[PDB]
Design a protein around this ligand. Structure first.
Ligand SMILES: Nc1ncnc2c1ncn2[C@@H]1O[C@H](COP(=O)(O)OP(=O)(O)CP(=O)(O)O)[C@@H](O)[C@H]1O
Ligand SMILES: [Ca+2]
Ligand SMILES: [Ca+2]
Ligand SMILES: [Ca+2]
Ligand SMILES: [Cl-]
Ligand SMILES: [Cl-]
Ligand SMILES: [Li+]
Length: 581
C-alpha cells in the first residue's frame, strides 16, 4: 500500500500501549489534572471535591478535536469530551452517589475539557495555566437555540422560558466546523434520569428514548431533583442534542443546536454541498436506531467565521433508508436515500402525532419511524474523506439483529451481530446535497480464527492477523488514511479469541487493506482521535482503563488507580504517523 507505512502489530493483552517498531507514546493529560495555575492536584484516594473536579480534566475522555492557533505553529487548542465516570474510582466509597455533593462530582466529570498544548523539541505538552483552559460540565450554564428553543416541551420550573439549560453530560464524540467551533454530542443522556415514583407511567416518547424510574445505574435523581422525572419531566427534552462550543472564547456560552434533532448523538461529521451549505452526518447510537443528516439553509462564509454564528439554527433534517443491496456475501453494495423530517411532509403531521416542527426535532426518533428510516446496527462515528468525500460509519454491533422488527438485510447482514461492520456511502454526483447515495460495507468485522468460512468470520479484508470487534471511533488524516478505533469485548476469549485488548487500526480506503497499529491497556476502549497540523503526532484517548479492576494505567503505582488519558503517539524519527519510514 501507498498509505500504510507500518507492519501490522500483534494483538496484545498487556496493561500498556503497544505500537509498531519506531513509534512511541507519552501521556498528554489524564483525568483529574488541574487545568489552572495553582489548581488542586489529583487525589488518588477519591477524596477530591466536586468543586476541584470542575477545574480538573474530566473523566472518561472520548471524542476530541484539535484547533490550530492563528500565527503560531507551536500552539494549539484541543476540545476533548468527557463522557461519563467510574464510580469505583471517583468516590472513596467506590459505590453509588450518597449525597448532593457526590452527584455534583459526577456531573463535574462530564462535559468537555478545552486545553492548550504547546510544542517544545517536537513534543506536544499540556499548558496548565493557559487562559484558554476551560471545563464545561454537567452543571455549566448553557443556551438552547434553533427551532425547539422556547417550546413548551423545553420549559421547566427552573427555566420557564425554555432557552437556558444546565449542563452537557454523556458527551460522546465530536465535530469540528470550518468556522472554528467544536461540536459535542450528548449520547446516553437518558441513563441519568430516574423517578421518585417507581410506578411512573412513561409516555410513548419517553419510552422510545429509554428512560426508566431506576435510571441506568446512575442514581443522581435521589439527590438532585433535576434528574427526577416525577418533578421535572421536561428536563429529559433539554438533553440529547449537539452542542456548539467556541474554544477560542473562554467566556462564551455554549449553545444546544436543536435544528440538528434530539437523539443519542455519537458524533457530527461535517461536509459541504456543492452550493456551499453545511452538511452534518449524525448517528443515533442505539440498537435498531437511525442515521441522520442535517443540511443548513445558508451558505458557509469561510472567510468571515463569525458570520456563521447561527448557521446551525436553520436548515433541514433528514434520515436514511437503505435498500436490501445486491446480496454479495462479502462486499454487499446498494443504494439509499435521505428522507426529510419536516412537519407536513412524508406523513409527519397531526394525524401521526406531530403538532409542529419543534416536536419533530425533540422526538426525531418517532418522526423517523413515521417516514420509514432503516433500523441500523448501532451507528457510532461517521467521517468524511478529505480526498474524495466518501462517508464512513461504524455499525458497532447489534445483538438483537434478527428479532421481530430488525430483519437481516443490506447493511445489517447478520443476526445476533457481536462484531460490527463499517458502512460507506458515496453521495450522488459527489454532491452532499444529493438525496440519494450508493453504499457498501467497507469491512464486516469477524473472527476467522474461530468462525472461518461463515458470516461470523468477517469479510475478506479481515484475517486472524488484523481481526478486531466493535469498531466505534473513526478518523481521517490529511494523507487519506482511515484510522479505526475499537470499543469491543476485550476478553480475548470465545468469539473474541485472539483479538486482545481494544485497539486502533489503519486502513487504505481505496483497497480495503487494514493493519493493526496500536493496542491499549486492560479494560479500556480506544476513543478520540486528532492529529497535530503537521501530522507528526496522533492524539488518541484511552477511556476507562481498568473498568473491571484490572489496570493501573498509566502511572502503574502499586495497587494504584487507573486514569483515562489522552496519549500522544509519535515516530522516533519525527516523520508522519502511519506513513512510510
Ligand atoms: N440496561 C440496559 N438496557 C438497555 N440498553 C442498554 C443497557 N445497558 C446498556 N445498554 C446499551 O446497550 C449497548 C451496549 O452496551 P455497552 O455499555 O457495552 O456499550 P458501549 O460501551 O458501546 C456504550 P458507547 O456507545 O458510549 O461506547 C449500548 O448501546 C448501551 O447504551
Ligand atoms: Ca463511542
Ligand atoms: Ca461503543
Ligand atoms: Ca464505550
Ligand atoms: Cl432506500
Ligand atoms: Cl479491567
Ligand atoms: Li464548495
Amino acid at each position: 500500500s501507498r498509505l500504510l507505512g507500518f507492519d501490522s502489530i500483534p494483538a496484545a493483552t498487556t496493561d500498556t500501549i503497544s505500537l509498531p517498531k519506531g513509534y512511541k507514546s507519552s501521556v498528554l493529560i489524564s483525568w483529574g489534572q488541574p487545568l489552572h495555575k495553582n489548581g488542586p492536584a489529583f487525589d488518588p484516594s477519591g477524596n477530591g471535591t466536586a468543586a476541584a473536579q470542575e477545574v480538573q480534566f474530566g473523566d472518561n475522555n472520548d471524542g476530541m478535536s484539535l484547533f490550530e492557533f492563528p500565527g503560531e505553529k507551536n500552539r494549539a487548542l484541543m476540545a476533548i469530551n468527557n463522557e461519563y465516570t467510574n464510580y469505583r474510582y471517583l468516590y472513596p466509597h467506590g459505590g453509588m452517589p450518597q449525597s448532593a455533593e457526590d452527584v455534583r462530582k459526577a456531573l463535574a466529570c462530564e462535559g468537555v475539557s478545552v486545553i492548550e498544548v504547546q510544542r517544545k523539541n517536537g513534543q506536544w505538552q499540556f499548558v496548565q495555566g493557559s487562559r484558554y483552559n476551560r471545563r464545561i460540565h454537567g452543571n455549566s450554564p448553557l443556551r438552547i437555540s434553533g427551532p425547539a428553543a422556547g417550546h413548551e416541551l423545553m420549559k421547566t420550573s427552573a427555566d420557564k422560558h425554555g432557552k437556558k439549560v444546565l449542563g452537557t453530560f454523556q458527551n460522546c464524540a465530536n465535530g469540528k466546523t470550518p468556522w472554528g467551533t467544536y461540536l459535542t454530542c450528548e449520547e446516553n443522556f437518558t441513563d441519568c434520569f430516574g423517578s421518585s415514583n417507581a410506578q411512573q407511567q412513561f409516555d410513548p416518547a419517553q419510552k422510545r428514548y429509554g428512560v426508566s424510574a431506576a435510571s441506568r445505574e446512575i442514581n443522581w435523581h435521589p439527590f438532585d431533583p433535576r434528574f427526577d422525572m416525577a418533578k421535572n419531566p421536561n428536563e429529559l427534552n433539554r438533553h440529547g442534542w449537539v452542542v456548539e462550543i467556541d474554544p477560542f472564547d473562554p467566556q462564551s456560552t455554549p449553545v444546544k443546536r436543536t435544528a440538528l434533532g434530539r437523539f443519542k448523538h455519537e458524533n457530527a461529521a461535517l461536509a459541504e454541498t456543492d452550493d456551499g451549505r453545511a452538511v452534518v452526518y449524525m448517528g443515533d447510537d442505539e440498537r435498531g436506531e437511525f442515521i441522520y443528516k442535517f443540511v443548513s439553509r445558508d451558505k458557509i462564509n469561510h472567510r468571515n467565521a463569525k458570520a456563521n454564528r447561527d448557521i446551525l439554527d436553520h436548515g433541514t433534517l433528514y434520515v436514511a433508508r437503505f435498500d436490501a443491496g445486491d446480496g454479495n456475501p462479502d462486499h454487499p453494495k446498494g443504494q439509499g436515500q435521505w428522507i426529510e423530517l419536516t412537519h407536513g411532509k412524508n406523513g409527519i403531521d397531526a394525524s401521526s402525532g406531530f403538532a409542529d416542527q419543534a416536536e419533530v426535532l425533540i422526538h426525531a426518533r418517532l418522526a423517523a419511524s413515521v417516514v420509514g428510516a432503516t433500523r441500523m446496527d448501532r451507528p457510532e462515528w461517521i467521517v468524511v474523506s478529505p480526498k474524495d468525500g466518501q462517508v464512513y460509519c461504524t455499525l458497532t454491533n447489534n445483538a438483537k439483529r434478527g428479532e421481530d422488527g430488525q430483519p437481516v438485510g443490506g447493511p445489517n447482514p447478520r443476526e445476533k451481530n457481536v462484531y460490527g461492520q463499517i458502512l460507506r456511502w458515496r453521495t450522488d454526483r459527489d454532491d452532499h446535497a444529493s438525496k440519494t447515495f450508493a453504499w457498501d460495507l467497507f469491512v464486516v468485522a469477524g473472527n476467522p480464527s474461530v468462525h472461518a468460512g461463515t458470516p461470523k468470520g468477517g469479510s475478506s479484508n479481515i484475517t486472524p492477523q488484523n481481526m478486531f470487534n466493535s469498531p466505534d471511533g473513526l478518523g481521517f488524516d490529511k494523507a487519506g488514511r482511515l484510522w479505526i478505533l475499537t470499543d469491543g469485548d476485550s476478553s480475548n476469549a470465545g468469539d473474541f479469541a485472539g483479538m486482545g485488548n481494544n485497539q486502533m487500526l489503519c486502513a487504505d480506503p481505496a483497497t480495503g487493506e487494514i493493519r493493526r497499529f496500536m493496542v491499549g491497556p486492560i479494560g479500556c476502549e480506544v476513543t478520540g482521535i486528532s492529529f497535530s497540523p503537521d501530522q507528526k503526532t496522533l492524539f488518541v484517548g484511552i477511556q476507562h482503563p481498568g473498568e473491571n479492576g484490572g489496570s493501573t494505567f498509566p502511572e502503574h503505582l502499586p495497587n494504584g488507580k487507573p486514569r483515562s488519558s489522552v496519549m500522544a503517539i509519535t515516530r522516533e524519527d519525527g516523520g508522519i504517523v502511519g506513513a512510510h519510514h
